[model samples]
Target: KVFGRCELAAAMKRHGLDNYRGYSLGNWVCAAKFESNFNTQATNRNTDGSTDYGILQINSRWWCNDGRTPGSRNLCNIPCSALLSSDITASVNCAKKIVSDGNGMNAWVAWRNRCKGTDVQAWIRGCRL
Candidate 1:
């Protein structure tokens, strides 16, 4: 049941995101939905020259840019690509940290209120992070 781009896109569309251009917020849903399909085991190789993997679309080098392999999981305890595959909730929270500029899920709260008009926590309640 290895998923490709289209499968991931369809899953994101299912979650209420209906469109995408190159990549945007919808890409987040696409990444979470398709990579893990709301499950914690999802992974994909970003062909756009990124080292992302697992649920949160994390770049390996960002956390552990120590002359290591671009996609290699090193130093960062969690996989270098995704935030914390070893701990899904923590991984998503880490991504949330980035998006919210240190305020964490405040951005997620705003996104839900603004985008879908619901504060049900998509990464957990809907997408399960």
Candidate 2:
């Protein structure tokens, strides 16, 4: 487990993620909740054999190489294990690159399936910052 919504929001804000790269904090938080429940170590294998890593569940095929997969692009150029850390600096930076690539939150299925066009304020309901 990582953090509750409030604490996670505070940490994201401290990391300058509240409005980084045109995406709102609410967008990030909502995606995080549905993707990994704020758990930094979260990993999941997809039906297509790609693995998702860390709190945002970034895919190994495009972002990180987990060594279990062949022909990984690894655009982030970091080991998949780096994303599993509780310190999310690398993860957040990689996410920035992802958004900058024009995918926005389109890279995360959870954001599309759950958070899209929804009211995401409750993801940070009690967070002061």
Best by TM-score: 2
Q: What would the per-residue lDDT of candidate 2 be over residues 33-89, giving only the tens digit for each residue?
A: 999999999999987788999899988889898888787789999999999998888
Point to the candidate with the largest lDDT. 2
Worst 10 residues of 2 by lDDT: 14-23
Q: Please give the lDDT score for candidate 1.
A: 0.43
lDDT of 1 at 39: 49
List where candidate 2 sits over 4 angstroms from the true fold: none
lDDT of 2: 0.87
How do the predictions measure up, each by TM-score? Answer: 0.38, 0.93
- What does candidate 1's lDDT look like per residue over 26-97, in tens digits? 545534553355445444444544455455445554433323455544434554534434444445444543
RMSD of each: 10.2, 1.2
TM-score for candidate 1, please give it.
0.38
Cα-based lDDT for every prediction: 0.43, 0.87
Off by over 4 Å in 1: 1-31, 61-77, 81-86, 102-129
